[PDB]
Amino acid sequence: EAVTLLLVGWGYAPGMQTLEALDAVRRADVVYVESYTMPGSSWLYKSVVEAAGEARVVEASRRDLEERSREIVSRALDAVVAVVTAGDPMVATTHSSLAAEALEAGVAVRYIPGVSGVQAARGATMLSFYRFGGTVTLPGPWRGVTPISVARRIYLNLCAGLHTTALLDVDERGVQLSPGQGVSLLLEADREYAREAGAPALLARLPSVLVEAGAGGGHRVLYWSSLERLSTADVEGGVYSIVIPARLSGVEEWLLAAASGQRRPLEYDRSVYETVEENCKKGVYMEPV
Secondary structure, eight states: OOOEEEEEESSSSOOOOHHHHHHHHHHOEEEEESSSOOOOOOOHHHHHHHTTTSSEEEOOHHHHHHTHHHHHHSSSOOOOEEEEESTTTTTTSSHHHHHHHHHTHHHHEEEOOOHHHHHHHHHTTTTGGGGEEEEEEOOOGGOOOHHHHHHHHHHHHHHHHHHEEEEEBBBBSSOOOHHHHHHHHHHHHHHHHHHTTSOOOOGGOOOOEEEOOOOGGGGGGESOOHHHHHHHHOOOOOOOEEOOOSSSSHEEEHHHHHHHHSSSSOOOOTHHHHHHHOOOOOTOOOOOO
16 A cells, blocks of 8 residues: 555534545544644544544644655655544645645545535525635734735725635634634734725725534524624634625625524625725726735
């Protein structure tokens, strides 16, 4: 069994593992498990060990996969090595680099998909799958960076009529940045960006959906009339993703209202989208930054 790498998505909660993923990890010779690319992933290690046998599972750190990725590509003996990620390994992680060096280093690579929390979150909002656009990550204050390029990508989605998926950063402890803090720094970035772009700051005025994908279909979908409101809200703790929609289609307002347990008309600033539209047409949002 020549060196073979298995990039396995484990799903984001117990019970969300596919049969082939369970099988793959059981049939591997070694099992590295990384729980740093996903917040609230403490359950991961235990769940894997449970599947493999407590005799092959191995905690893998970021620098191990990023700095010492040359080892995991273990081209020393010849074996089946598995790298397990909560969610899906190709969604919002840089594990494709591991697969690429492996492929180039002769190793056979198998990508076993898993349900990612991002996909489940987008799905829970019930917004049109076809309208989702680019995804950004809102940095925590420990990165020491005001996300100006991030604000711009959101406007780029808006100009294309696409919904933005905004992920929240995670620190050392594996603690997710709170929606309020993530959005606050985003809005500070927006004010800085609009300033240099020569246009009013508009993101604070956009409605948004705060979602936490869950197990057994228990997702939580909360409609926020404006990001301004969310930026100062101390919401319940949770592993969330934020969806900042482009102007909703009539059918979408109905779908989103049902998903968030809200009544139509959904309330939100009724002039912000037309103003974004105007700046889009003026070419304001292309420089770049």
